[model samples]
Target chain A: DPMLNSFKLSLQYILPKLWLTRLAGWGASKRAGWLTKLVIDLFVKYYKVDMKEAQKPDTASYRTFNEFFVRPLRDEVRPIDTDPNVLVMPADGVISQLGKIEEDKILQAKGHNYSLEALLAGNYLMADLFRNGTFVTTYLSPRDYHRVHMPCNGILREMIYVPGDLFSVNHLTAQNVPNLFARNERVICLFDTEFGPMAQILVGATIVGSIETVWAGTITPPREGIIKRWTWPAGENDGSVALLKGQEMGRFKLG
Target chain B: DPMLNSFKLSLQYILPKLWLTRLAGWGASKRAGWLTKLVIDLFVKYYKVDMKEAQKPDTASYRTFNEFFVRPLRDEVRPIDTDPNVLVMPADGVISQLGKIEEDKILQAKGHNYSLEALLAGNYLMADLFRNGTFVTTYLSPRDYHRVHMPCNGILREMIYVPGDLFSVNHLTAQNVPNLFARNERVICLFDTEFGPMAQILVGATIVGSIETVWAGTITPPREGIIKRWTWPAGENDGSVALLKGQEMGRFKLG
Candidate 1:
């Protein structure tokens, strides 16, 4: 078992991961008539798509595999927690890692922990603000709901796209790869919440088409090898981008 | 050779690189009597540290290994390029990579090119300034001078500390690793030169004690895991941090 895992890990370095991911992204967005339906049908059947909770129950309604992958859910199906003090879950993924940042380290796995500053891509100001704060890394798998919502009511401060390798992110990779999350391409959204500053990071992975936010559409596909950033106004103003607790913030397209 | 190299690379994952690096940092700074002298003597003999150009040539004159490692050169020994149009060499090291940024990508090795935006750690403004500009990566070996100098007359605008894994940066690692410089912990210095915006990045590696600047003292080993930053007045004001070409900007202490 260890040998097999080691072999798979070695494949990470040997494989043309970026090119493969780009190809997967291109294929996921293809809008061919029968091909899209066939791919979607296979995915739904294999992953066990629950049409009962989806806004559009009919499989034929979707035009592409990406559409089906990022399909909207019924409003009544998942209600937001209304309690003032309660913070909601951002996505429907297992809590891969969660804990207080001790001496600026976030526990990545049993024997792995990465720095908060590196995770924020050297945004020291934000890193300082959330230095002693808690962090929760929610990992979205193929079967989980991909949409990410705000955990608490907050006003957007800044958004940054840190370009990195799209290595597959999961329990195995997180445990094996050094600086897994920080090294991977990701979107960092810094928001000012009642509790203080809140950061929601949208990490990119292998076959992940692109990271998209409600404010700024699709982030990657061109994969511009540089960090792209957007800053919003602080107080309540026309320039400010504000969101309620549990509001849809972003989603991952099938890549 | 391939098998041996692969074995060494594998050690990166197994070794507690951060802890080892931190221990090295501590040991390098220690004012121990005979131990410091022994290290300095051994290093000088092995690396062939040329003392002819050093400000203090005597081996016993140095108090610690850090002092000996960051020894300053005589001003007359390494003269600055006085031609108004010429850019001086920033450090005494081999040019690992140099070229024009194509589609925002800077070549790291033969098949490896990283994005300018990523190199700037998401500083889009600077990325735009030097988008189509030329870039040169200088590799400072253990034997070379560790001090970094100003390439051109410039006024400092900002400095950013991007935290990351201190992977060994050289020809082999640069060739093998994807996003080597971008992923490594580094100090990004942004300045306004006569031609345009100039950026000088001092990348950190395993066993590197810390990154420092003329304006700011030592940067890490409190490894705070937060991106620290400093902004200076752009104009030639009292608040501005300006350096003439060939002027010493920073040095790496032995760790």
Candidate 2:
């Protein structure tokens, strides 16, 4: 109980509140070679990152910790599923829950479920897509692959960036934290796939540094407080941009 | 246009409309050994099928033309894609058009569009799912894979089988025939996936006999002229029946 209080108190102190994330994002973007490698080497051992899978195996090779964090995997490591009907795992983390969204609820833990609506920052039109559809929650540990991939092929329809309070997203904290996945500063990715409609959410935390994607770099780049919505100009993408299954979609920076 | 008219009048000679399709379905079901072999021989020669790909390579090995027509391919030839957010072609054939549905219309040819509503046998709920959604039409020739696979993994919600005029679905007929897909008997497969909603319509052809799915057998099994919507008994299959991508969904007996 003493450790619990200290944890919450310390989190509040370094809540990484909004200002720090942008401040950290700027710092992480810099090509700080020595410190980047220092951060990489420092975290690798403790994080259990298998360097062998990295496209650039050398730690000193990275321009920034951000590049190293989103390092490409060896081609053989995770070959994407070629089948049309299946959605591959978006990230390498362990899946905590996968189920049909009954109305607006999603299972968080035993006897605990969160709102699918809350996760999208109350954008119910997008939220309704998951209703009667399935939802899968994966935990990205420090060691897991950072880059997310297309669960299935998709045409980008829209995205919403919502800024919120930053909290550590982890097993203990997420369980203890109120409205964890929904309340966090996050980016909502909406894309259309053949099976119907689908979505992928890239969330944020104090230590996450930043989230970048294939289509847009550092999607949570908005320093603004307002939730922003974007759509491709009516016909410019008249011919859609297609991402094949297993194409890298987005990633998190260092924890 | 004269050639088109000639094709139409010639098709009228072998209409394949009602009695013949039923007569053919009944005739094809009987395992009449050598007679089946003769039919298979004629098709194998005329269809120019590359017999080397079949699980049973020898034309003589199959019990009936229907058996040989729906013969399995060697497992190594068609591997399923395991990746996420993707859909592969449901069958081995050339595509006509794959695009968004404009209200209720789908492109049948450059100058011709068909009713999405009529194709679903007037189930507007299922029809509306494709409102702004995409649809793809492929021509399955006698040489193509007779079996249909889920374009993506889905849970089957319901299937509607409407006994209509069974007309030929091949190029010589489809382009020339009016309401070709709608007028033909068909089984409408409704399913849901991570992608909002989806459907696979096994549009019947005079040449295509008795459609059967992996779940329930013989979809267009009606001896009468009524439209039948079938579902599993209340408690059994209480939830939707799940079918994975590339799982064999249905098959036609023969042309």
**DockQ for all models, in order?**
0.19, 0.01
Worst 10 residues of 2 chain B by lDDT: B227-236
- For candidate 1, lDDT tens digit of each residue in B1-255? 998988878776457666678788788788888898899889989988888888888878878778888888877788887998999999998999787878688999898888887777776666788877889889998888889999999999988887566778867778777787887878888889997888899988888748888888887656554355678897768887888988889888645
- Candidate 2: residue B86 lDDT (0-100): 84
Tell me how large the interface RMSD of candidate 2 is: 21.8
For TM-score, the strongest prediction is 1
TM-score, prediction 1? 0.61
Runs with alpha carbons beyond 4 Å of true place in candidate 1: A1-77, A80-255
lDDT of 1 by residue, A178-240 (tens): 788887878999999899888999988888848899988888766654566788999768888
lDDT of 2 by residue, A81-200 (tens): 777777788898898778888887887777667777667655556767788778888888878778889888787887776655577776666555656677666777888777777889
Model 1, C-alpha of A71: deviation from truth (Å)? 16
- Model 2, position A115, has a per-residue lDDT of 77
Q: What's the interface RMS deviation of candidate 1?
A: 5.1
Considering only chain B, what TM-score does candidate 2 achieve? 0.89
Q: Which stretches of candidate 2 lie over 4 Å from their true place?
A: A1-255, B1-4, B13-16, B231-240
